[PDB]
Structure formats: C-alpha cells, structure tokens
Amino acid sequence: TVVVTTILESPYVMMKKNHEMLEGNERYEGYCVDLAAEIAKHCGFKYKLTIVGDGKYGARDADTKIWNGMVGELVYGKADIAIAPLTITLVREEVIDFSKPFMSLGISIMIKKPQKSKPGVFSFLDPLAYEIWMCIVFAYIGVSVVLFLVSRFSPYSTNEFGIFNSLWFSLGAFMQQGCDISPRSLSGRIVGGVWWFFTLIIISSYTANLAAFLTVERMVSPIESAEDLSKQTEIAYGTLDSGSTKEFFRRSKIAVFDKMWTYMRSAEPSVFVRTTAEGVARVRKSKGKYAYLLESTMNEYIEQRKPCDTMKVGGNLDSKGYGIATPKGSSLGTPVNLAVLKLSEQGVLDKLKNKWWYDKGECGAKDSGSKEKTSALSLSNVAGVFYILVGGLGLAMLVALIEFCYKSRA
Amino acid sequence: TVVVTTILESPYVMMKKNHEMLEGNERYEGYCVDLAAEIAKHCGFKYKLTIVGDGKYGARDADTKIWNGMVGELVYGKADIAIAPLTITLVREEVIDFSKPFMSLGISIMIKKPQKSKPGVFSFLDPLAYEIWMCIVFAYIGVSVVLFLVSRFSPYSTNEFGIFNSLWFSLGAFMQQGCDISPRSLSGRIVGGVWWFFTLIIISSYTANLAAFLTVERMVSPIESAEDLSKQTEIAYGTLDSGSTKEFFRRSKIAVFDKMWTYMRSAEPSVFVRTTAEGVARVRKSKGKYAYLLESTMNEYIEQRKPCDTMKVGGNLDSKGYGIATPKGSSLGTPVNLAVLKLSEQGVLDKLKNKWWYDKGECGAKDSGSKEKTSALSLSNVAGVFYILVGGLGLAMLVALIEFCYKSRAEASRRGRALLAVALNLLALLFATTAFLTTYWCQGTQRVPFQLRRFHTGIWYSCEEELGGPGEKCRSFIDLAPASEKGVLWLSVVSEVLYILLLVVGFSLMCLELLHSSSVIDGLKLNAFAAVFTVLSGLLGMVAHMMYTQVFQVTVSLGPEDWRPHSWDYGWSFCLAWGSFTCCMAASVTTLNSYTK
Amino acid sequence: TVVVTTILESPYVMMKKNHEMLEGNERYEGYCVDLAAEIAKHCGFKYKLTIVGDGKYGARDADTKIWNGMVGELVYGKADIAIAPLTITLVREEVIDFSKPFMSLGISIMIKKPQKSKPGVFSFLDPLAYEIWMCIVFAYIGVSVVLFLVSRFSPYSTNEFGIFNSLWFSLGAFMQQGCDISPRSLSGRIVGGVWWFFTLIIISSYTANLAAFLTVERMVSPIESAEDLSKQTEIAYGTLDSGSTKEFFRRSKIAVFDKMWTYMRSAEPSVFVRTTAEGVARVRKSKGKYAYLLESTMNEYIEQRKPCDTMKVGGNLDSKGYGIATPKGSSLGTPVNLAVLKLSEQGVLDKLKNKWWYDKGECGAKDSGSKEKTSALSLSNVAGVFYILVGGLGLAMLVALIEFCYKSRA
Amino acid sequence: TVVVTTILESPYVMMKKNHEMLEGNERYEGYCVDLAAEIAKHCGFKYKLTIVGDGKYGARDADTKIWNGMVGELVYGKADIAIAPLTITLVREEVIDFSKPFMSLGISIMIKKPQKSKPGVFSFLDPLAYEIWMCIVFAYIGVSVVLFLVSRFSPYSTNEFGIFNSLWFSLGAFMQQGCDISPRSLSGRIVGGVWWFFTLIIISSYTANLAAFLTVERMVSPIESAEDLSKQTEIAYGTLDSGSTKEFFRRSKIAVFDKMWTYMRSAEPSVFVRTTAEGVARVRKSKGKYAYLLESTMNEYIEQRKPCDTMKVGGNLDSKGYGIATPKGSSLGTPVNLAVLKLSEQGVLDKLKNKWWYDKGECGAKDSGSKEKTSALSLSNVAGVFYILVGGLGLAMLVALIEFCYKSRAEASRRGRALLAVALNLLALLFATTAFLTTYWCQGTQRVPFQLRRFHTGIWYSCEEELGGPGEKCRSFIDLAPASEKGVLWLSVVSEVLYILLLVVGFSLMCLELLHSSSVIDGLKLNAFAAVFTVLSGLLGMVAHMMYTQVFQVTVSLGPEDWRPHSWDYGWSFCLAWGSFTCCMAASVTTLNSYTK
Numbered sequence A, C: 001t002v003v004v005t006t007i008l009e010s011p012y013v014m015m016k017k018n019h020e021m022l023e024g025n026e027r028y029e030g031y032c033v034d035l036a037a038e039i040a041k042h043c044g045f046k047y048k049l050t051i052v053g054d055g056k057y058g059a060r061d062a063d064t065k066i067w068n069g070m071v072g073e074l075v076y077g078k079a080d081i082a083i084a085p086l087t088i089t090l091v092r093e094e095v096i097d098f099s100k101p102f103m104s105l106g107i108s109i110m111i112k113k114p115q116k117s118k119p120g121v122f123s124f125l126d127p128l129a130y131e132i133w134m135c136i137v138f139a140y141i142g143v144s145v146v147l148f149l150v151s152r153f154s155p156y157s158t159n160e161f162g163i164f165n166s167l168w169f170s171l172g173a174f175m176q177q178g179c180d181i182s183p184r185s186l187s188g189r190i191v192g193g194v195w196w197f198f199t200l201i202i203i204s205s206y207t208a209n210l211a212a213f214l215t216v217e218r219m220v221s222p223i224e225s226a227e228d229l230s231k232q233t234e235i236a237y238g239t240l241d242s243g244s245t246k247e248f249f250r251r252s253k254i255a256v257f258d259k260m261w262t263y264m265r266s267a268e269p270s271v272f273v274r275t276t277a278e279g280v281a282r283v284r285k286s287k288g289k290y291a292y293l294l295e296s297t298m299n300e301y302i303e304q305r306k307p308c309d310t311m312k313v314g315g316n317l318d319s320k321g322y323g324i325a326t327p328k329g330s331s332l333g334t335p336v337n338l339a340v341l342k343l344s345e346q347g348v349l350d351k352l353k354n355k356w357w358y359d360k361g362e363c364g365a366k367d368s369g370s371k372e373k374t375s376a377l378s379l380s381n382v383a384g385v386f387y388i389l390v391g392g393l394g395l396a397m398l399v400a401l402i403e404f405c406y407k408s409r410a
Numbered sequence B, D: 001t002v003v004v005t006t007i008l009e010s011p012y013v014m015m016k017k018n019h020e021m022l023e024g025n026e027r028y029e030g031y032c033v034d035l036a037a038e039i040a041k042h043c044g045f046k047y048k049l050t051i052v053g054d055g056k057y058g059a060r061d062a063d064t065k066i067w068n069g070m071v072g073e074l075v076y077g078k079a080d081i082a083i084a085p086l087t088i089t090l091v092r093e094e095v096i097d098f099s100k101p102f103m104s105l106g107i108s109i110m111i112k113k114p115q116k117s118k119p120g121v122f123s124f125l126d127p128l129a130y131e132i133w134m135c136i137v138f139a140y141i142g143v144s145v146v147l148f149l150v151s152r153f154s155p156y157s158t159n160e161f162g163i164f165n166s167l168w169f170s171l172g173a174f175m176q177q178g179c180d181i182s183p184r185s186l187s188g189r190i191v192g193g194v195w196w197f198f199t200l201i202i203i204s205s206y207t208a209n210l211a212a213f214l215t216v217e218r219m220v221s222p223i224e225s226a227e228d229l230s231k232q233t234e235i236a237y238g239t240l241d242s243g244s245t246k247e248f249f250r251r252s253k254i255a256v257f258d259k260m261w262t263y264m265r266s267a268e269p270s271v272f273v274r275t276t277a278e279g280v281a282r283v284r285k286s287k288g289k290y291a292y293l294l295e296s297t298m299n300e301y302i303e304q305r306k307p308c309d310t311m312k313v314g315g316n317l318d319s320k321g322y323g324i325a326t327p328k329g330s331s332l333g334t335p336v337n338l339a340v341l342k343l344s345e346q347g348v349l350d351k352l353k354n355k356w357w358y359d360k361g362e363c364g365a366k367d368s369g370s371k372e373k374t375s376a377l378s379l380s381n382v383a384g385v386f387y388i389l390v391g392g393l394g395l396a397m398l399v400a401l402i403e404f405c406y407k408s409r410a411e412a413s414r415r416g417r418a419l420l421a422v423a424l425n426l427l428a429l430l431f432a433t434t435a436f437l438t439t440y441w442c443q444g445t446q447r448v449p450f451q452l453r454r455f456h457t458g459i460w461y462s463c464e465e466e467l468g469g470p471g472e473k474c475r476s477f478i479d480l481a482p483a484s485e486k487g488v489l490w491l492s493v494v495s496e497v498l499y500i501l502l503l504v505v506g507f508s509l510m511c512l513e514l515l516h517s518s519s520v521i522d523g524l525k526l527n528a529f530a531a532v533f534t535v536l537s538g539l540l541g542m543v544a545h546m547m548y549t550q551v552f553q554v555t556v557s558l559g560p561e562d563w564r565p566h567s568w569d570y571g572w573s574f575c576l577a578w579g580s581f582t583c584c585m586a587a588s589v590t591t592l593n594s595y596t597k
Ligand SMILES: N[C@@H](Cn1oc(=O)[nH]c1=O)C(=O)O
Pocket: A057, A058, A085, A086, A087, A239, A240, A241, A242, A243, A244, A245, A246, A276, A293, A294, A295, A298
C-alpha cells in the first residue's frame, strides 16, 4: 500500500460521527480526504490515511538536527506521502520535494471577538469630542465675559448683570432652564440671542449623536496590524510549537517580525502551543488576553463554525503555499505533480473549496450583524454623571464652608 | 369488503369526541371520512376503515429500499384503497396508482403569528433601567436637601429656599420647566448648576435610547418568503420525519431549496418532527424561533383554530394535488377516478369544502383585523403616563381636602423635633450597619445543566447554598471579581465603611443637641456641624452603593465561569441600604429646620 | 422538419443581439429554446423554432368558434408542436393534449412600485396616533380643570391661578416654556409636578418616533389582495386580450373574481392588452393607475430585470400549470411525455430554472433596500405647521377684533 | 544582441522625463529597467530594449487561439526575453518558459479612498432645507409684529410689549428659553400659544432629522473584502482588457468569484479598461462608484503618489509571482533562473525594492494618520455655530459703542413717520406686483441627452428658451401641474391676487393718514384699520408663497415627462416676493408706532 500521513486538523481531516465504528479510509472526512482520494484515482495507488504518530506538523531541533512530525517520517521512510496542510519552506525544500500550490493562504491573526466592554466612567460625554467640550467652556466663559463689558457700559440705575450674574445667565441659557433676569439692552440681547442659538444646536447635536451610538454599535478591534502587536504587550500572542509559522519568525529579517520573535521566547508563561485546536481554546478562554497567529484558511473555517467567537484582524502577514509533500526522489513525484496540475485545470480544487468552507458556513457574518438587540441603558452607562453630581455636591459643601467663615472674619 | 386506510390528521380524518362510545365507521370523522361514504355511494362497495400502524405517510428509504407507512400498505397489499391526505408525486406514481387530483395545494410556511402588542403599563420606563430610575429619585432628594443646607447656612435676609420650596426647585430643574426662584449665593449656584448638567444628560439619554428602540422596532424584517428564510439562521426549519415535503426538499435542485436542505441536513438537534400535531406544538412553544413547513390546506385550518396564533407567510413554494390512491393494477381504480370526476362534476367536493372550513372556523377574519399597520405609538405605549397623570390628579384632589381640613383645624415642640431627629438617626445607624453586616444584597439562582442553586451575595462573602440540605458555602467576593474592576470595589467598601463612621459622628453629635445634654449655649453650631456631617454621610454612602451595583453587574456578565446566575435581582438590605440613605437626610432636614428657627 | 411554435416572450423566448444575423434555431434564446433543444435530443426530431404568425397565446371567439394564436395553429395543422408558455385549461384540453406540468405558477398582481408619496398636510403629527392626540387635549383641559378647583379652595389673598391662567400654565408646561406663575400649594404643586412628567415622556416620545420614520422608511402597498382590487376602483387593472388568464375570469365561479370580470368589460378606456410586453409599459407609464395581472413566473423575471420598477403584491390567485402543447393524436405525444418525465427525473428542469431567473437577477432585492439615502426635510414635510401657524394667526386677529369691541360695548 | 521586451507600466517600466532627449537604454527607467542591467551584469549579454506594439500583456483568445501582446512576442519569437510585470500562470507556463518568481504579489482591490471630511461652514444647516430656514425667519418677523399689533389695540394701562420687546419675546419663545414678560390679553395668549406649538414641532424636527443623518452615517458599511463587494451592485468592477487578472476570474470556480464574473460578463457599458493608467483614472472620477481590481504591488505604488486618494481594501484574493520569461526551449533561460536566484542570494532584489518604493514615496504614512476612528462630532461639524457665535459677539460689541455714542449724542417727526410708512408701502406695492407680473421666479436648466435648455417659470407661464437663438417658448403653468396638487395651486394664485388687492386697501388708507389728507379728527381709527389690513395683507400673502414652492417642488419631481430640470433654484422676484412681505410689516410697525403715541 501507500501510507499517507495527514495531521488531524479540521476541516482538512475530520473524524466520522461513528469514528470508532469505521476503519481506515472511511473513518476520515475533510478536504485532504477528498484530495487523497482525487489524487489516487488519477494515479492508481492504494492510499492508507494515517495520523502522524508524533502528532506534529514538522520541525527540526537546530542542535541535534532531527526532524519530527510528518517531515521526519517522510525522510526516514516510515510514511510514503503527505497530502496534508504542510507549508513549502526553504528548509523543507532541501529534504523533500513539493507539488505546486493547490491552495494559496497567508498567516493571519485570530483574536477573541471583542464584545461590548464596560463603558467608561466618563462615557456619557462621548457624542461630543474633547476638542468641542474644551471650546464650549472657553466659549461659555468667553460669551459671559462679553455680557459684563456690555452691562457696565450702558446703565439703562444698578447693573444686575455683574460678572457674578453673567456666568449664571449664560449657564441657565446653556442648561435649558432660563433665568428670571433678562437683558434690557440691544447690545445685551444680541449676546443673549446668539448664545441661545448656540445651545439649541449643541443640545440637539448631543441628543442626536447619542441616538447614533445606541442604535448602531461598532465593536472596535483593539489590534488590527502587525504594528499593533509589537508596540503593546497588553495582549499575549503566539503560534504552534512545531510549525512552519514558528519557523518563519525564527528566520525573519523584517525588524517588526524580529521584535515579535524576541518577545515570543523571552516572556513566558507557556505561549507556544502543541495543537491548533489547543490554540483555539487558548483564545476563547483567555478573555481578550491571547491572539493566536495561524493561517487564513485555518481561520476562515473557525469564523464560519460554532459558536463563532473569533474574528480575523488585519490580513495576511505574507504569502505562503500548500503542497503535497513527496519524499526526495520518489516514484509518485511526477504523476502526483501532473495530478496537481490536472485537477487544478478542471477547477476541481476550486469546486472543492467553494463547497467545504461554505456549506458548513452556517454562521454566515449576517447572523451576528442583523441580530440587533433592544437594550435599556444600564447604570454603567451614566454612572459618571452621578459621580460628578456628588462631586459637585461636596464642592458646594466646601464653598458653603468657606464663604460663611469669611463673612465671620470680615 | 374494501379496506380503506388513512391517518388521523385533522381536519381531514379526525377521531370522534367519544372514541370508545361509537363503533366502526362511527369511530372517525372529518373531511375524508365524509368523502369515503360518497365514494361508496357512487361505486357501491362496503368500505372498512383502518389506520396505519406506524403513524406516518412514509416513503422508501435508502438502505432498505422499501416503502413504509401508508404507501407501504398500498405497494404491498395490506390495504385495498387509501382515501387520505396523500400527495401525488412521481416517486409515488411509479409504485402505485392515483386518481385525478381533487384538492389543489402547495407547500406553505407556518411561523408563529407575531404576538399581540402588549406593552405593559410601564412601557415608558423601557429605555432606562429601573436601577437608574431609583438613583434619579434618591439623587433628587439628595440635591434639594443639600440646597436646603446651603441656603440656611450662607448669608448671601429672608430665605425663599425652604424644604418644601427646595424640592420644588429641583423638580422644576429636572423636568426642564425651570423655576422663578433663583439661587443667588455662589454655593447655591454650584449645587444648581451641577444638577442642571445632570438632567441634561439623563433626558437626552432617555430620548436617544427611546429612538434607539423604535428604529430597531422598524428594522425587524418580518420575514415573509422562503428566500428571506434561507438567508437567516435565527429560526429553524423542520418538516415531518417522512413525507412528501421532506422528499421534495431532498430531490430539489433550486439554489434556495438546496441551501435549506443543507441546513436541514446538519440538524443539531434533529429539526424533523414525528407528526404534524407535535410539529405545530414546537411552533407554539418556541415563540417564533421555529418554523414548520407544511401543506397549505393544513395551514389554513390550523390558522382558524384557537389560540389562532400561527400565521401563514408568503405563498406556496410548489403546486401539488391530493389523490385517492389504489395499488398498482387494481381494477377498482378506474371507477375511483370516475367517482372523483363525478363529485367534481356535481361540485360536491366544493360543497364538502366550504361546509367544513367555514363552519368549524373558530376565530377567523385575519385579513379584517390586520388592515391596520402600526407605525406610531398606540395609547397603550404611553398609557402608564396617563395613569400616573389621572392618578396624580386624584391624589392631589385628596391633598386639597385635607389641607383645607388642616386649615379649618388650625382655625379650631423643639424638643420633639430633636427627638424625631435622633430617632430617625438611630434607625439610620440600624439600617446602614444591617446592610454592611448582611450578605443578602443580591438574591439570584445559578444552575448546572437541571439543578439550580439559590444563593445570596454581598460585598464580603458570596454564600452559595449547597443542595442536599442547607449548604451555605461562602466564598470571598472581593478577590472573586476581575481585577481591573476590583479597584473600584476596593473603593466602595472603603466608602461604605466611611459612610458608617461618618454617620457615627452624626447621631452622636445629635446626642449633644438634646436639652438634658451638654449646653444650650453654643450648641447651635454643634447642631450645625452635626447637620453638615449627616449630609456628608449619605452622599458618600450613596456613591458606595453606586460603585457596588456597577461593579456587581460587570461580575454577572464578565466573571469567573463555572457559575453564572440567571437573576441578578437586588435582595433585601440593599433596599435598607437606600432606606438608610433616605433616613440620613430625613433626619437632617429636621435639624436644619430646628437650626433656622 | 418539426415546426415548433413559441410566442415571443422573455425570458422564455429571447432575441439574439445580432438577431438579424443568425437564422432559425440560433437566433432565439431563453428557456423554451433550452427546453425545445432538450426535448429534441431525447426524442430525435428536427425542430424549427417559429414565432406564431398571429402573435397570440390562443383563445376562441365564443360565437364563431374559431381559435387563434398558437392554439388554432396546432388544431388546423400549421404548427407541429408547441413548447411555449401555454396554460393547461379545460377548453384547451378538449382540442389538444398536454404534457405534465414542467413548471408550477400562479396568477399574480404587478403594480408600479409605490415610491414615497408627497406627505400629507398634517403628516407632522404622524408619530403619535389620533387616539393619543385627542386624549392629550382631553387630558390638557382635564388637568387644567383640576388646578382651578385646587386654586379656589386654598387661598394661601388673590388666586392668580384662575381658569384663564390655568390653561395657560398647563400650556406652558406642555410647550416646554415654563411660565413665571407657580403654585404655592402642595395640592397645587402635585398637579404641576405630575403634568410635567406627562410632557417629558410625550415630547421625548414624539422626538424619538419621528426619528424612527425618517431613518427606516416603509413604502406601503396601497393594494395587496384580490379583495383590495374589487372594493376600490381607484386603480385600473387588466389582463391580456387573448390569454388563459382572461379565459379564467370569464368562467370564474367565485364572486370576487366575478366582480372583477364585470368591471373589466364594463368601464373601458382600453383595459386589455395585446402583449405582456405591452402590459409592462402600461404599468410603468400609468403612475400607479394600472396593475397588470399576469403569471408569477412572468413576474419574477420583471422584478429581477432593469430598471426593477415593479413588485409583486399579495400572491397567487390560483394554481396553474405549464405544459408542452401537443396536437390531438400526435406521434410525439408519448415520447415527449416520457421526455417531460425523464428531464424532470434528473432535475434538469430545476437546474435550468435556478440558472435563468437568478444569473440575470442583477437587481437582487438587496440593491433597493440597502441603498438608503441621506435626505433633508423638504418643505412638504412640515408644510401644515406653517398653515396652522397662520391659521392660528388669523384666529388671533379675530379675537383681538371682538374683545376690543365688547369692552367698547360694556 | 538580446532583444528585451516590456510594457510601460509605472513603477516598473517608466518613460524618462525627456523621452526625445535621451537615446536607447536611456529612454526608459523604473524598477525593471534597473533589473535588466543587473541581469546583463551576471550573464554578460548586450540587451536591446523594446515595447510591445499593442500596449497590453495579452492572452490567447477564443476564436483565433493565438497569443497577443507581450506573450505573443514570446510564443512566436519576435522578442528574445521579457523582463516585465508578467504573472506566472499555468496557461502561460505551457506556452513559454518562466524563471523563479522574484516578486510575490496578489490581486488586490482599489477603490477610491474615502474622501476627507469637509463638512463646510454651514453643516449644522443640513437637516432642514434652506427654504425652511427662510420661512422660519419670515414667520419670526410675522408673529412679533402681530403681537405688537395685538398689544397696542387691546385694553386688557402700560404696555410692556414694544416692537423691540416683542421681537425679544418671539426669540425667547423660539429658542425655548422663554421670557419673563407674559401675554395677559387673551388675544395675546392666542398668538403666543400658536408660536409655541410652531417651535416645538420645528426643533423636534431638527433633532430628529439630525439623528436621522448620523444613524445612516454609521450604517455606511465601508466595504473591505470582495465578499461584501460581491453582495453590492452600487459599485462596478473592472480589470484590464486582457491580462492575468481577467483570466483569473474567468477560469475561477469559487462561488464568490463566479458571481462577480457573471456581473463582469453582463457589463453595460464594458467595465474592462484598456490600460492601468486609464483604469485608475476612472476611479479618480467616478468618486467611489467604481472599483478597479489590480495587482497589489501596483496598488501600493499608486497609493503613495498624489493625490493619494486611492486606498487598498481587504487583503489579496490570490497569491502569484512575477517571472522573467523566455520563449519555449531557449538556451538562455536557465542562466536567467540562475541570475534570478543570484540576486535573491545577494538580496539585491530587496535592495531594489526598499530603494524604489520608499524614496519615491510622495505622501506616505497612511496607517499613521488613520489611527483615529471618527465617531463623534468634530469641531468642524458645528464650526459655523461658533463662527456665528464669535461673530455675533463682535457685532454686538459694535452695537455697544454706537449706542453709547447715540446716548452721548443724545446728551449733546410724526409727519416723517407717516412719510416713511407710505414710502415703504409704495415699495411693497411695487415689490408685490412685480412678482405677480414677472415669470422669473424659478431659474433652472433642463436637458436632452448633450443639449441643455435654460428656462424660467412662474405661476402663469413656463417660458422655455428655445436654442438656436432667443427662443422664449411660453407654456401655461396652471394646467401643467398634476391635477390633485393643482387645487392648492389654484388657491395660491387666488391668495396672491388677494395679497395684492388687500395691499391696495393698505397704502390707499395710508394716503388718508397724511396731514394734508382727509382729517385729523377720526383719522386714528382710519390709521387703525389700515394697520390691520397691512398685517392681513402679508400673512395671506406669505401663505400664497408657501403654497407655491410646495406645489412647485411636487412638479419638479412628479410632473409631465419630456422635461425635468436639474436645478429648481429660486430666481429673482421670488426674493422680491419676500421683500414685499418684509416691507409690508416694516411699514406696519411704523403706523402702529404712530398710533400708540
Ligand atoms: N501548519 C503549518 C504551521 N502551523 O499551522 C498552524 O495552524 N499553526 C502553525 O504554526 C505547517 O505546516 O507547519
């Protein structure tokens, strides 16, 4: 027979529902089970689908020079061929030969899907920017300055609009509760006129834009680039402990990628993982503190799988290739390479790809977006208003303290 | 004697009301039972009625290649004729014989009807949670008392800011209608100007969230056709376990129909149902999260029976016909087709039709009541505002009678004020310290998949009752929270202790107010700093309960897994925690009133 | 050869782009061109695709007993077979034989797609129902009644809150501009308290729901049933002047359908049409005044065609069937009937149907719905407010007239 | 001497700045030109540079089965070697030879970059059209004058409702800040209570429509991937007329890629472009309504050159490689592959890379400036409110200087009031009747597909200028409108005539006001009914222009086809129509002022 080594990875290698019932080539499902069947039909060999006994993709110790996983089995004669998610690298090219890329891909970043956070303490003042709020208070004092200059100039006996009253009238104008004082001057009432039309826009601007936040919500990704990871060590990130992606960061010559691999080895609670299926649960059970780096074609299946708790961010860090790994000088190097050509000529590999990623894609991205909710405001939303309420109350207590005693002094 | 087979499917074949009382042909009723006597009327044969032993129409299976159910009786020969809700299909045509289609139908889609709009009497409280509506009211009492302190202390005379008037100032400030009395002390202007910035955020938050509801209330997308059903996985799709409908979606090749059949294939759990009466029952209980795809003539009848809460959506997906079936090559099948054409010529089929569906219509008139398309508010949506309005008129009517009776009784002391001031403060001590010592602030239940665990928690110990007895396993709440939110929870426990100790300074200085106590000379300034510290008690204490429920609600959503409650309801002695805060100011208004006179 | 009669109807019969260039079986495109090719392959006959010379589907004069169109040609020997949109009726069954229904369908209603109308004069008061607005004014007077009863009872000299002032204070409370008068009674201030919380909900209810209208718009169909047509003669409606749909309303025994056919013949500017392609332009150029009744499969193509100016309303009025019309006693009755079976056994007719209606469906319903617009309020929206403004102004002039003269009288 | 072919594609092969001044190899530059000298450095051959005569890379066609463009030179033999932006593809592999892929790339998607947010200085006027903002102002003048009439006539004394104060009452009523002066006459309460119900609808309409913008401003769906491009036909998709990208979408079989290729098939007009520089140019001019799908390395360079207004969206759809190509079986092709590996070993390819893309970066730093995600208002969005604010301060500063200079000049008649009252009324006659007689109220242009027709219309005649000269073909406007809206247009023409005739009663009764006229005795009541009829002039006249523009804007959208303007702009003598209405009250305030003294 022909021993085919495939690492157990969904959706390339799947177990049957009665997996202990069936044996061999019937037990396994997925994309490589399709491709090993489609290759052996146009090449004529008896394929035996075997899980790799070591369990790994394949890497060499740099000191003892010993490959493990699927790579060491093909060199040392145990496995006959590999039709599996193996990535064509230069170090793998020197020991075995690869077919043409039947699938294109890229290394991506998979984070825990950022749910709506607890709002900030001062998240009530979100719908106006801080560039506005400072310029409001500057215009709040600045308008109230002008009304006192006007009030001193035109007496028409006493000027009720002192500077102690002008901030009060500009406040009651801004806070929608008009005060009983009113300018009796044309040079006054134009200021009180234009300051009213100030608030009528701004309060309507605040009321409108806050309805824009509560209706249409956009859960922001805290990280969306390779720059976003290396500049901030707040979220951990890692790869598999025996994989070509880990091989990529070791031999990387871009300094950002070099900054990653220096951080990957140095600060260690256990960053690297044994399995991709380990790395999925390392994301989902870390609550935003872990972002597993893996292939985009690996990540497009997890995004279209229950419970769809993860998302892609950014994009491909580099281009790569998937190939059927044949041993060096094998008999079925040339017929498999012609089979990789011939199945890709008919679009058989494309009619496989648009089936498997899509018919299982029951969490199509519409189901998360179109499921909006009718949510009341919790106390977390406007909590900081009560804080500055009491923070205004205790400030009023201290002014009532000092102004009583200064009149006792004077 | 001819054997007649069918299945118990209302409205077509119905069991009688008293199945044991009656015998033979009198054991069953319905449309098809009325049809079967008409067939024997024209063809002159004794007919023996039977029911299938399986309880399903059935079709041939993959491995066994044998017809089961009703068709298996027809193909093999266990029955002589089927007068039954049986779809003529080409896979059924090649195995046995059919008549002319007497009843036309199509595959329709049954969802549960969109439920009646019952907004409730408190539907206007929907944008802001009830936690906020309390904390508005307790802060409404807070600012008016502070302004009643500030007005009496400061010289800035006569005072227009009495405790009756100061609550009228903050109610004028909160409802945006303003007030004619203006704060003229600077310390009075601070306490007004902050409460103004309070009510401008809250009302704008109330308007914005109410607009955030009704925009989403219009983008509900009331799914009508199967194309918009195929584009949505919020609602499941199930049919009968083996019928003509499941086999229709099996050998379909339309891209809409294939994409549903792939969704029907990977069913976790199995969406297909055993019978129609079970299949309609899942629609009754899943509340519009499940859709049952059935034949339209069954859909029209079940629409017309109580609770009438199932609605047809869209049109027929296909066009099929019911046929009275005989086995392959029987001699009786040709006068059967002549009999079906005979009642078609007489119009007795349509006589059986409009008799049955109309006289057993229970509720009816669905297109009559649904002429209205609701897009505005109903009166019911703001009805509780009217009920508070008409009620608040009637309460204030009773105030006018008693106040005039108080004025007529006025036509017909300070040691007691100090006695009532300490007595509320001794409650406020007893109400606050009970809250801090108890652990029953939050009554909720958490479960494992069907064992639930009733438990209560506070600031210190989350005491979970363990089943099999009393339980009461208590775990520390402080390290229980996640750590970034924990620092606020550190600050709240400090502030709640700071609330108690400043209250201890409060009522102990109320003890010096007493006439048998320290002095009459220079005691009014001791009443003054007592009055300051009771306001400074409850304000710092209210923040401690603000910071509790904010951090607590984080822990309910984002917290340690292997425990998640279903209810985060606020238990007793949280009510007493606010009842402490109520009695803090309610004694402080007394000692301000005793100070000013 | 075998003369095939097909009425020229898209998407069943289409003309090529260079239609004058090619001849015969290459000139024609569409669904019946597929089906005539798929039938003649499994039956073995030379098909000639001919347009019917008279141009019609087929109907008989009830007096001279002469069929025309495709039906008269099959009876009188001119045409050999019909693979065309012909509907199996009882009167057509007596003269020729039909195959099994290769396509199911129903008679539907196609209206001009109702664009956003000019708004009403009083369309500003839409977000609150008339059941509310009457009960507001009843509660407006009703609250103001209570405050005058309170004001007369408790004197604490003069009662400023007369009935002439209490409607004014309840108005200024309702219209967000608080008046300088204020109750000095607890039995007063509770009424003024609860009436303020009345408006604060209602004005927020009006502001919120009006944002619901301008954001999410629902263009309502004025007619959506067969009941909706016969009860109101505001919109005209008709069928083709020689067709089985017209044959259906003549022999109809449901009184609603009978009410239609009585209206179709009686009130006539020219209701019935010669062509379905005539009936499409009769819809699009009538501006809502015409609703062409035709088949659902005819209507699913027009909805998925440029410029998608029409929509289905309601549903199928009845079930029908499409059949290949063979002459009575023909040779190719049985092989075509077996061909209609055999092509439907493989799902060939279904893989034709999901292609033609869908690959041309470039106006998929998403393109109309997801294209929302950022539209300002025109003057048509709030026009009636200015009308009742001046309508309030002239009423103020007349009260200023009569109250001056009555004090001159008294 | 070896023939080198390529195509002029920046940044890879660029023509020099002075193409006629330089000769031979010095006629071209770029990345690949720098590469070609390095190839001849390692392999030692004289290289002759050529450009394809067609101007495209090309591929084999269906009918002819021949390779054209660059590959046709390679397959046939017209060139010796191609060092060119040529994608290695299996259909290109079987016909000629390729080297090792030196540059990795993928098919990217170029849309125009989302344009910079320039809200304008009047962005706060966006929810309400400028027609409304005028009609608010003219009704603001309307109600205050009416209230100034009502206050002087009625006894209800001293009057606190002067014409300066009455405009301050309505400005307090419109801005919701209220006013301390209360209307106490019942006729004064009517005119206040209606204007209150005015300003409550308008401000709530202003807040609701501004919320209606910003909700849609957040559901813009900024399309990033091709899947969300495949789901949207608002934006077209085009590639080069014959390249590796179009052939990639041709023989693709992915359901996303097939659905785009079916959309690319039925192109009306043809979405495919001749070259890249033309293809990027359609993206520059179609303003985000067109998308050009090109290779990502070209996308990175064109992103970095001015105006830098094209942005990459999503990632690569595929993974491909550029290859230096030789014909099938040439002996030179193996040292070519050794040369490509040699510069790969040296890293001179990456030396050519980071030299070229970085030093010819014009704007750069796109991820640096786009760190901010705008979700709140900028200062620019309400900037014109500040500019009116700071400006309205500075205008009112100048009022204080002049009014004190007026007071200092006060420290240092009634026939003239009546003279100014008639003179404005004689204008108001001349301003109104000019509007009714002219037909230039609406200046717009309508077109046939490229001939435009400038025209002007009014209430009576829509006078269209006919080209080839002056034209002026005039058609009746009254029957021109649709008929249900026409009845309002009937009422407006009646009201505008009613506006003129009541104004005729106005200034003719102003003639009796004159001192040389009828009498001094009992003339004040003749001044009174004159003053009533001038208010009753402009109010009924304003409705006539309200009903015009409402019915006119219907006719622009819903009207007789074969004519539709692009602009419905309001021409002159519509401005004079409001200028009549301004002068109606501006004379009426004079005769109220002359009456009260
Ligand atoms: N599969 C890749 C490497 N790899 O795959 C993962 O899912 N993680 C990871 O490092 C290989 O063939 O070496």
